[PDB]
């Protein structure tokens, strides 16, 4: 959540997290990236965005 | 309690006649108008496509038709 609708670096700091939760094996198994596919990124977002 | 219970009695009697008053005369009523929901999507531009049309040859110029 952001108080400014989110934008470039919103993006960037997303696939950092992202990244490093696919490293971690031991607890994380899968995470279903919508948000960064432009094809389904308009359901992962908020209509104010 | 020979003096005592009548009243008592009454008094009860009359809240529980209120009380199943205040709930069933509100009960009635109470939808007027229906009221959709509203589920949009994210209008964002982000990594958008981009399309580049290029035109060249040896003439100087060109007539040229195309769909956006």
Redo the contacts between chains.
Sequence with gaps: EGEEPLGIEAHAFYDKMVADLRADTEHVQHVQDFWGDTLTASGAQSVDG | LGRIWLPVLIVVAVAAGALIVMNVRTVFGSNPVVVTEKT?????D????VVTYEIFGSGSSAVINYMD
């Design positions: 949009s999507d994210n209008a964002e982000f990594n958008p496509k």
